[PDB]
Amino acid sequence: AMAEEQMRLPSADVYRFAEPDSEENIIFEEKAGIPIIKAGTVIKLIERLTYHMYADPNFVRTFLTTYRSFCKPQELLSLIIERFEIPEPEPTEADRIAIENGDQPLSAELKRFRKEYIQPVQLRVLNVCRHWVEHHFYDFERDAYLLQRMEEFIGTVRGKAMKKWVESITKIIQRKKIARDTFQSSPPTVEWHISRPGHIETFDLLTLHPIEIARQLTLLESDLYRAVQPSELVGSVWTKEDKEINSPNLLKMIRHTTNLTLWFEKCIVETENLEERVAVVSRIIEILQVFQELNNFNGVLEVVSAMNSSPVYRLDHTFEQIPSRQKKILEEAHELSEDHYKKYLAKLRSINPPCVPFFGIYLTNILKTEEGNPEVLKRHGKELINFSKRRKVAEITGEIQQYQNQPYCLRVESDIKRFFENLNPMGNSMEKEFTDYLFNKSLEIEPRNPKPLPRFPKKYSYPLKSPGVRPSN
Ligand SMILES: Cc1nc(N[C@H](C)c2cccc(C(F)F)c2F)c2cn(N3CCOCC3)c(=O)c(-c3ccc(C#N)nc3)c2n1
Structure with a gap:
């Protein structure tokens, strides 16, 4: 019966992001709210990054933090552009006939597929693009060619339904490029000792x-x-x-x-x-x-x-x-x-x-996560990117950001x-x-025990007594 669900999606020869979920391409953890992706092929990760059924701001955030560990920025842009380009189903027999009589087709399924699959996936892709330029603009600063691809892609999106999203992304890209260059109390006085200002x-x-x-x-x-x-x-x-x-x-x-x-x-x-x-x-x-x-x-x-x-x-x-x-x-x-x-x-x-x-504790615990967890999981002979591993690393970088x-x-x-x-x-x-x-x-x-302790001459020719650590007014 649900097979009726997957026959309403494009075929694998015209579109790569609608093959059915299987134990050999996507795995989740174990509620009846959003599932937690544990592992998948990069194709299944992209599919769920831009999933039609619901927004998933935690996966979007975690994906765009961690993706460079399994996918190049250039490849990610290629995959989401490909995700965006969804083929429409053929007309029904009755609508086919009507079309070649120059008559209006009903297009019931076509209209439903557009509203319930294409529009939302496309909105998910523009949402990913916005998060990417807002929170990871360094990708585009390090790769002027990536920024050129993003702008052509965004600049050729059709529909007033996506005009808003497009203008928003273009705003963020322009604010970022433009960036190229305090207090509620007074601070205490700058303290000096033997060294005086400027000396x-x-x-x-x-x-x-x-x-x-x-x-x-x-x-x-x-x-x-x-x-x-x-x-x-x-x-x-x-x-x-x-x-x-x-x-x-x-x-x-x-x-x-x-x-x-x-x-x-x-x-x-x-x-x-x-x-x-x-x-x-x-x-x-x-x-x-x-x-x-x-x-x-x-x-x-x-x-x-x-x-x-x-x-x-x-x-x-x-x-x-x-x-x-x-x-x-x-x-x-x-x-x-x-x-x-x-x-x-x-x-x-x-x-x-x-x-x-203390920064060192985060580095220690990320390294233990990197070395203690595998890069990929195996199901039914296939290799799936270990996303839970990236999520765990991202939670530690989450703790860094808090401060x-x-x-x-x-x-x-x-x-x-x-x-x-x-x-x-x-x-x-x-x-x-x-x-x-x-x-x-x-x-x-200070030599080791048996040998006694020599004397050494003074090197400092100024007073060694400390001014102490009271700031005093
Ligand atoms: C209270 C204290 N302070 C240390 N260092 C401070 C900064 C310190 C350093 C230098 C001088 C002083 C001085 F004021 F005496 C210090 F307090 C310690 C340093 N180390 N090492 C850590 C790795 O590198 C070599 C030294 C230790 O193993 C222990 C230790 C030993 C046994 C047990 C038990 N049971 N628990 C802890 C230390 N314990």
């Missing part, structure tokens, strides 16, 4: 104010967190060949984290004088204290990584001189990470904006921003050469 040559860990290091690193990290698009995290594209094109905001975030962490370690192990090194560790702990004040969890866990690093953690003689109060701040910061970040998560959900979440609209009430300082944008602790060395050298400096400044 950039004197900028260093101990010469800048620790309050203002933490503030400027929080602003720079806020912006880097906010620039990351979910698609930069799908199908591990930041760990593969085209990384710089596909994941540029993510790589900037990872490279800042690497550079700040390694710079902290470098500042520590390259201060060979024990008394001066204690001052460096203690200043980095105060920077952490201000990160916490600002709910910059990213920065907090960057300081934790530095102190937990194989070169730093072994410095028994240094941590021996750190006052109890500073050790406790560092211990409680570490404990954020224990038991799969239980206390970090409780803390994140308990605070009020603004914040910078990307939280600007800080803090003045920028351009020279300090520049100073931290320009961190290059590794020099022209690669990462393993640098970490090996840091460990070997550690051994030199």
